[PDB]
Amino acid sequence: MEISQPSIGIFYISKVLALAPYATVRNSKGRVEIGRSWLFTVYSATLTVVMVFLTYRGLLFDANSEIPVRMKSATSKVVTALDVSVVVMAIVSGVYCGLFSLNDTLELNDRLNKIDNTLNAYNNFRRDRWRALGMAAVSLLAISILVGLDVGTWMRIAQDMNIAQSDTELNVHWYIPFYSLYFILTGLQVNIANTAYGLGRRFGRLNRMLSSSFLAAAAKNKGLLLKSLADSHESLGKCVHLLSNSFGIAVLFILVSCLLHLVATAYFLFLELLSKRDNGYLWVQMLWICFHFLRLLMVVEPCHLAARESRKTIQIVCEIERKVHEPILAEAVKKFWQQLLVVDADFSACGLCRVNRTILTSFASAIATYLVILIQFQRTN
Amino acid sequence: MEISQPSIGIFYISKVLALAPYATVRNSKGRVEIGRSWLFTVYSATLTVVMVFLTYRGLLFDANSEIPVRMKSATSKVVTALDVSVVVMAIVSGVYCGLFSLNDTLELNDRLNKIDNTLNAYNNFRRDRWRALGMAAVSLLAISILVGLDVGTWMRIAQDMNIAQSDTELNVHWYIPFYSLYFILTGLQVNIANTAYGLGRRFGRLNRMLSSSFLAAAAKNKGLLLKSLADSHESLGKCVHLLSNSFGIAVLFILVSCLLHLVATAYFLFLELLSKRDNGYLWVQMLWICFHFLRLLMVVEPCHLAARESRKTIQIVCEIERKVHEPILAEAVKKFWQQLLVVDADFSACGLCRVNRTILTSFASAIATYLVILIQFQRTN
Amino acid sequence: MEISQPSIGIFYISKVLALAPYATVRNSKGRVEIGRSWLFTVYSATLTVVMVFLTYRGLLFDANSEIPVRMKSATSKVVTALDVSVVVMAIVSGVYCGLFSLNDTLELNDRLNKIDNTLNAYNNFRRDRWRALGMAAVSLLAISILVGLDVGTWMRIAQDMNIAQSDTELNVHWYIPFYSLYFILTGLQVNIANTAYGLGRRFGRLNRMLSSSFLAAAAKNKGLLLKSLADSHESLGKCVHLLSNSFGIAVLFILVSCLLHLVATAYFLFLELLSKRDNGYLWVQMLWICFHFLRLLMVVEPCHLAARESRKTIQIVCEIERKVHEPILAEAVKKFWQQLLVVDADFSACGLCRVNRTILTSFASAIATYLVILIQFQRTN
Amino acid sequence: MEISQPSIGIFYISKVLALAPYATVRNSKGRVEIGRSWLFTVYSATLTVVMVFLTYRGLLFDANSEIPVRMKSATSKVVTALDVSVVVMAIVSGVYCGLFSLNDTLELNDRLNKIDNTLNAYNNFRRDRWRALGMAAVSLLAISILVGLDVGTWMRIAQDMNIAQSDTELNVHWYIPFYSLYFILTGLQVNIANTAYGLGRRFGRLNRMLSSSFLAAAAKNKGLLLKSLADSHESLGKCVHLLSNSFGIAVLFILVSCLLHLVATAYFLFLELLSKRDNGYLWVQMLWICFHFLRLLMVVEPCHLAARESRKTIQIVCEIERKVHEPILAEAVKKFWQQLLVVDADFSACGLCRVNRTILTSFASAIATYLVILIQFQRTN
């Protein structure tokens, strides 16, 4: 987890969302020293437990209500349970990663501080702050809008089937914990995306510095600069591995929830497109599909970019080697090339899979298969 | 995008098809200088927008017609919408790539000019022109024949179900924009195939030159020649990456359309083969299947050939190294071998997948699965 | 197969379970000399043959009984046959591997003795013994508890459908050979997991020793130590290959049984969750699912850990090379790096697949597909 | 295609089966000079055309017969057509490869002659002849037995449904061309397996020679021997590539036919196992399944063995390098290691897939999916 001054807003949003239980103090030199926050550690743990319990209690009550609005039939019961369960697993894994990653966070932030010192010439504090705040604000606004639309639509549906025997809106009111879990999931995804985008952006800055200093007496200084860049590349790879070791299970469960939500929402979208019951529900489901795809991209694109930027450094170094002739510089470039020959740049989700754009192809194949099966099933009955 | 004098006909065909909005002027030395064409940029943008709008307006009208000819049932509606949508996505992605690839096109053409200067001994202007014109002519003729057959068959079908209440041929007339989109797609695929085949052919020429000059005073000249060949190989790899970065989304959507069209056309072919309603429709669908498979090959084979020819250069260089003994030449060959050790030759479709013949195996597996599901569904009802 | 004094209990458990037909004698220096045990070889062979015959005889009798309890319908017959057959294949492959792996076991134990001599500073006899005995005890206790619960539940089911015409509990009594096969399978899996965990743990110890001796006159001794560590790494890779060559078919059939059991048990769990017949059966099936997943992890995690620990040694050696400057030590580190550049660390299940955590992703995909098909089938009828 | 004196019987069997249209003359030194045989080229071409035409004419007649025995229903018609078509595609591709591979065969045999000269110490003429003749004889005997059983079973089935209106045995008599195609397919598979096994066996002999000469004045001779072994390894890799380039399409269509036959035969086996109509048919179908799996192994195992033996040479060479110290020998071993670092050992089926044991896993997954779909389809109706 990256905790830096430009993107401290994301850190605070995660902290109040029970995902970053860390106490941070800004040093006199600007470095943000990090430590464990026992108060906020307990806050996160009990908030997660209470919210998960409330979510499942609401599910049970809706199932046991006089007239369930969402948990009505066996199929609807199973699908609602699956959706809530994937959200719960994602947020619980994120909270667990936040609780048990103080050392990884400390090491990652120290490495990032050293790297940023190395790449000081390319730092843009205002641009980084605005990008991070824009990502957080747009994600939170999108999830808030979608939660509001979903709550309104479900209240409308419940009132349509409402009977004088019992009030049905309280069933919807009991689904608020689920949407709070959605907010926590959005915060977790924003935090992970911020960290991964930071790593990829620093890889890109390192490549740009390499090209600008080696492709466009003092030979010793140039060799020192190349050694610093090689060390920064190695440290960025280690930072990618730190983020993987810290949030691989969280990313894995985020991907699982993305896949399940995409499949279920596409299935219901097709069902209602053939039925043509309510158009408002159709647009709401389309917005939900867009949001699920967008968060899948938010978790996949950063890792793909990081891997790509880490892997093109070897080509840059090969060009430098073919262009450089000085003995010390040539030896340093040879060492850097040998180091890059065996780097593992890709983000690994607990070793289950490699997180890059090929995951999008796998998800597309799985969604196509499941949708074919389910839709051709509903068509033949 | 390759824009060279031998294959300028393909460039003009793409330009009038809203895919290559570039103004080209032939220099006194034969080099084709390229620049942005604002007139043709606007022409391409508005032509694409208007044609897509007309296609979807025709779909809507047919759905809303007195007696739809194609958009009759929910299944037929969905399948027609899917087919038109994949075609629209493919052509729109191709047009977008054409609009936003002026710099990539310029760099690729400059690199190709330098490489052809290096490989001047193997250039065959007349053969290249005839191959390019033959590919363009055969592709355009095949799509024209298929469009004519499809229009005739659909007019026959509409007249068979025609009633005195309303005229049904106008529904078919409203599908002309869809076939114009098919023509644009054919032009886009021909252009991409021409560029990729050019890259693969230049890789093959480079390998042949290497073998002919190193396997079948002056040592300095030979080392210079080997350095030029190594630089040409590196530049050809960079050209493959340029084509990828410029048209990866277009290739991805072309592959998606190929997969969807193959699946749908095979499904309907099997359905009518069991029903045995009209044989003419059966042969038309078989021709459509052949055309879809042929364009899938046209997009897959060039990339596979380019990767293969790029990858066998390392074996050629290993043989040269085992055969060469001169100090300067040995060092140059060692440098070339080190460069080849870490080349990424494969074409990447936006990072989603690697475009080679294995995509054919993946498509075969997906088509087999989908066809099994759908056909066994229709058999059990 | 690893046969060491700390984990001799696992060896004895496997020996009495017809999986390790070896006679072992502890030398005066503590080394456990191993040889073929013809008495126990015959015991294992005839025990396996008799138990498999009894299992299939019980299946046949239950099918031919007056009122079958498990082999009642065609679907139930097929599923019970498939489950029993996967268990039989797994245990038979394990027994065959045990019978025909005396030379591999001898070589592996000799290599492990030499490696442990090299890594003597990190040996923990009591910890290894307690971990091995805990794994064996927990596995055997879990399988015993599950077998008891299954037998009780099936006796309850048989008595519920019991009629005065015939006694149905004898049908359950005829399924004891199947549960004995389950015990043999548990022993085989514990043995394989013990060996693979030993290899991975020794890889980790080697990496820790490397880091502690090279990252935190005498230069010759340090070079000798590095040479010994490199030889230990090579020998550990060869030991992984020995375990693969010896038990690849056993691991493959264990994975096949895990996949089939997970699919079938999840299918029945969903069926009874929708039916809601008996909750006790539901919890028993959930426990069975947990056990199948746990044994899948027990066979997958050790190989993944071994591969990971083998692969991070190259990064450690790269750091050492960048840190070391002495001529002899630098040359030794270069040799070690070259050796590590081409190591194949992964466990191969007879070449069919590479055993690591990606197998979990493949199993998840297959289970999801099969469950979607089967459950949507049962829903549409 | 390997054409050597020890395995000349396989060559003659292929030649009379229209697969090896080559004229061979044994030189005074034992080398089998090969050339094109125009008489046998024409014989092969017309035999293949006539047999395919007769097969499809028999299919058409059976479909159009008074009471079809095999092409009765739409499902049976489609399945019989698919089976015959996969067999026809396999044999036609094999014949085409035989016709258009004279140069590849010549180069492969010359390379094999040179390699066998290098590896003369490990040649076993009698063992090779007996292994080749045993493979050919067992394959031909198995296919003959299966064809006889199939013909007898189909005659029994036709006579059971026979009516006095028309004679039904002539329908079976019209299926003889299909079984002749089966014989041609068996010959093609035996030939390909013989060649691939030869390549793998020579790789193993090379590895054994390396180990026996480098792991268990004259230094110049030893370096010459190592250079000869390295050249033999490179030539064996080139021979694997020659076999791939010559018979990749044949192997691909053999694999496709294997997959289709396995799926269809398993489907019918399960259908009749649930129906329990005739046990003799059940055993015949089980034998057919065993034969299809055995020929899948016959095409997959040789390539896997060749790749494995080619890939372990690098480990052997690494050990030799760590053990050798002489300057000339050390340089030769370094050159050999560099050569092995970049070898592509695997057999490629026209680039569609890599032929090794993982193809068995892919086939198992595909068969499981298709069988699940089809069987659960038949169960729910």
What is the DSSP code string of A202-215? Answer: HHHHHHHHHHHHH-
Q: Under a CB-based contact definition with an 8 Å cutoff, are residues A38 and A45 in contact?
A: no
Backbone angles phi, psi at A26, to 5 degrees: -80, 125
Chain C touched by D325 (CB under 8 Å) = no
Q: What whole-number distance in Å separates Cα of residue D92 and Cα of residue D88?
A: 6
Q: Which residues of C touch D358 (CB under 8 A)?
A: 351-353
**Residue B318 one-letter amino acid:** C
Widest distance between CA atoms in chain B:
91
The token pair that represents C149 in the structure block: 């619960």
Cα–Cα nearest to D36, from D47, D50, D25, D27: D25
- Amino acid letter for position C73: S
Chain centre to alpha carbon of residue A96: 15
D277 CB neighbour count, 10 Å cutoff: 10
Is the CB of residue C170 less than 8 Å away from at least one CB of chain D?
no
Sign of the C-alpha dihedral computed for residues A289, A291, A295 and A298 taken in this order: positive
Q: Within 10 A of D379 (CB to CB), how many other CB atoms are there?
A: 16
CB contact, 8 Å: B380 with chain A? yes
> What would the 3-class secondary structure string for chain D be?
CCCCCCCHHHHHHHHHCCCCCEEEEECCCCCEEEEECHHHHHHHHHHHHHHHHHHHHHHHHHHHCCCCCCCCCHHHHHHHHHHHHHHHHHHHHHHHHHHCCHHHHHHHHHHHHHHHHHCHHHCCHHHHHHHHHHHHHHHHHHHHHHHHHHHHHHHHHHHHCCECCECCHHHHHCCHHHHHHHHHHHHHHHHHHHHHHHHHHHHHHHHHHHHHHHCCCHHHHHHHHHHHHHHHHHHHHHHHHHHHHHHHHHHHHHHHHHHHHHHHHHHHHHHHHHHCCCHHHHHHHHHHHHHHHHHHHHHHHHHHHHHHHHHHHHHHHHHHHHHCCCHHHHHHHHHHHHHHHCCCCCEECCCCCEECCHHHHHHHHHHHHHHHHHHHHHHCC
Q: Identify whether the C-beta of residue D259 lies closer than 8 Å to the C-beta of residue D364.
A: no
Answer yes or no: are the C-beta atoms of D86 and D256 closer than 8 Å: yes
Tell how far CA D254 is from the center of its chain.
Answer: 7
Tokens of residue D339, six digits: 């050569």
**Residue D225 near residue D329, CB atoms below 8 Å:** no
Collapsing DSSP to helix, strand or coil, B70 comes out as: coil
- List the resolution, Å: 2.6
Tell me the helix, strand and coil percentages in chain C, rounded to 5: 80, 5, 15
Geometric angle at alpha carbon C114, from C113 and C116, rounded to 5°:
65
Query: What are the beta bridge partners of residue B355?
Result: B347
C102-118 and C176-214 are packed helices; what angle lies between their axes, rounded to 10 degrees?
Answer: 30
C-alpha closest to that of B187 among B100, B283, B87 = B87
SS3 C161: coil
* Pair of tokens at residue A173: 């009111």
Residues of B in contact with D229 (CB under 8 A): none
Of D253, D122, D138, nearest to D198 by C-alpha is D122
Contact list, D380 vs chain B (CB under 8 Å): 380
Asked whether A339 and A235 are in contact (CB, 8 A), the reply is no
In one letter, which amino acid is B273?
A: L
Quote the minimal CA–CA distance from C107 to chain D in Å: 18
Q: Are A266 and A371 in contact (CB under 8 A)?
A: yes
3-state SS assignment for residue B327:
helix
- Checking A83-87 for CB contacts under 8 A at 24+ apart, the result is A83/A260, A83/A261, A83/A264, A84/A55, A84/A56, A84/A59, A84/A178, A84/A181, A86/A253, A86/A256, A86/A257, A86/A260, A86/A261, A87/A178, A87/A181, A87/A182, A87/A185, A87/A257
Q: Mind giving me the DSSP string for A165-201?
A: TB--HHHHHTTHHHHHHHHHHHHHHHHHHHHHHHHHH
Nearest-angstrom CA–CA distance, D254 and B157: 41
Contacts of A233 (CB under 8 A, 6+ apart): A203, A206, A310, A313, A336, A339, A340, A343
Cα–chain-centroid distance for residue B300? 8
Helix H or strand E encompassing A237: helix A218-275
CA distance linking residue B229 with residue B63, whole number of Å: 59
SS3 string of B216-269? CCHHHHHHHHHHHHHHHHHHHHHHHHHHHHHHHHHHHHHHHHHHHHHHHHHHHH
SS3 at position B381: coil
Alpha-helical runs (H) found in A276-379: 279-323, 327-341, 358-379
Instruction: Spell out the residues 6+ positions from residue A63 whose beta carbon is closer than 8 angstroms to its own.
Output: A71, A77
The type of residue at D64 is N
Tell me which method was used to determine the 3D structure. cryo-EM
Instruction: Name chain B contacts of D374, Cβ cutoff 8 Å.
Output: 372, 376
Which among A334, A339, A312, A110 is positioned nearest to A231, based on CA atoms? A339
Contact assignment for C366 to D361 by CB distance below 8 Å: no
Q: b/e string for D98-107 if b means 16 or more Cβ within 10 A? A: bbebbebbbb
| Phi, psi (deg, nearest 5) at residue A304 | -60, -45
Neighbors of chain B by Cβ distance (3+ pairs < 8 Å):
A, D
Element (H, E) at B354: strand B354-355
CB within 8 Å of D176: residues ≥ 6 apart: D58
**Residue among A239, A20, A17, A18 at smallest CA distance from A115:** A239
At B97, list the tokens: 């790539």
CB atoms within 10 A of CB C286: 13
Query: How far is the CA of C115 from the CAs of C119, C199, C239, C242, in angstroms?
Result: 6, 10, 10, 15
- Read off φ and ψ for residue D208, nearest 5 degrees: -65, -40
Is the separation of the CB atoms in A177 and A51 below 8 Å? yes
Q: Measuring CA to CA, which residue among B179, B181, B172 is closest to residue B71? A: B172
CA distance B80 to B67: 16
Give the separation between CA C109 and CA B300, rounded to whole angstroms. 51
Distance between CA atoms of A365 and D154, rounded to whole angstroms? 42
DSSP conformation class of B122: G
| Spatial CB neighbours of C333, under 8 Å, sequence gap ≥ 6 | C226, C317, C320, C321, C324
Specify the 3-state DSSP secondary structure of B32: strand
Q: How many CB pairs under 8 A join C and D?
A: 41
CB C6 within 8 A of CB C125: yes
Q: How many CB atoms lie within 10 A of CB B165?
A: 8
Query: In angstroms, what CA-CA distances link A22 with A18, A111, C9, C108?
Result: 10, 18, 46, 48
CA distance A200 to A194: 10
Please give the structure tokens belonging to residue A145. Answer: 């809008």
> Helix crossing, D8-16 with D176-214: angle to 10°?
160
User: What contacts A359, CB < 8 A, 6 or more positions away?
Assistant: A255, A300, A353
Look up residue A339 and give its two tokens. 């180091």
Residue A281 tokens read as 């529900």
D304 touching C (Cβ < 8 Å):
yes
Q: Name residues whose C-beta falls within 8 Å of residue C288's C-beta, 6 or more positions apart in sequence.
A: C146, C150, C261, C265
| Cα(A364)–Cα(B5) distance, integer angstroms | 41
Q: Do D356 and C352 touch (CB under 8 A)?
A: no
The rounded distance, in Å, linking the Cα atoms of A268 and A285 is 8
Q: Is D315 annotated as a binding residue?
A: no
Chain B residue with the nearest C-alpha to that of A308: B351
Residue C295: how many other CB atoms lie within 10 Å? 23
Quote the minimal CA–CA distance from A231 to chain B in Å.
Answer: 21
Find the distance separating the first CA and the last CA of chain B, reported in whole Å: 50
**Cα atoms found within 13 Å of the Cα of residue C252, Cβ hemisphere only:** 20
Three-state DSSP state, A324: coil
Amino acid at C140: L
* CA pair distance C72, C78, nearest whole angstrom: 10
Strands C32-36 and C347-348: unpaired
Q: How far is C219 from chain A (nearest CA, A)?
A: 23
Residue type at D203 in one-letter notation: F
Inter-residue contact C68 to C79 (CB < 8 Å): no
Helix (H) or strand (E) holding B34: strand B32-36
* CB neighbourhood size of C221 (10 A): 9
User: How does strand B354-355 pair with strand C32-36?
Assistant: unpaired
- Distance (Å, whole) CA D255 – CA D292: 10
And the tokens for D123?
């040649």
Does B315 sit within 8 Å of D342, measured CB to CB? yes
CA distance D367 to D131: 32
b or e along A60-73 (b: 16 or more beta carbons within 10 Å of the residue's beta carbon)? eebbebeebbbbee
Q: What is the DSSP letter of B342?
A: T
Pinpoint the alpha helices (H) of chain B.
Answer: 8-16, 38-64, 74-99, 102-118, 125-160, 169-173, 176-214, 218-275, 279-323, 327-341, 358-379
| H or E stretch at B348 | strand B347-348
Which residues, including other chains, have CB under 8 Å from residue B123's CB and lie 6 or more apart?
Answer: B116
Two tokens at D91? 């044999």
Per-residue tokens: D79: 């399945």
Q: Is B70 within any annotated ligand binding site?
A: yes
B158 C-beta neighbours (distance < 10 Å), count: 20
Q: Does A337 touch chain C (CB under 8 A)?
A: no
Give the residue from chain B lying closest to D359, CA to CA: B361
Burial label, A231 (beta-carbon count in 10 A; 0-12, 13-18, 19+) = middle
DSSP line for A121-160 = GG--HHHHHHHHHHHHHHHHHHHHHHHHHHHHHHHHHHHH
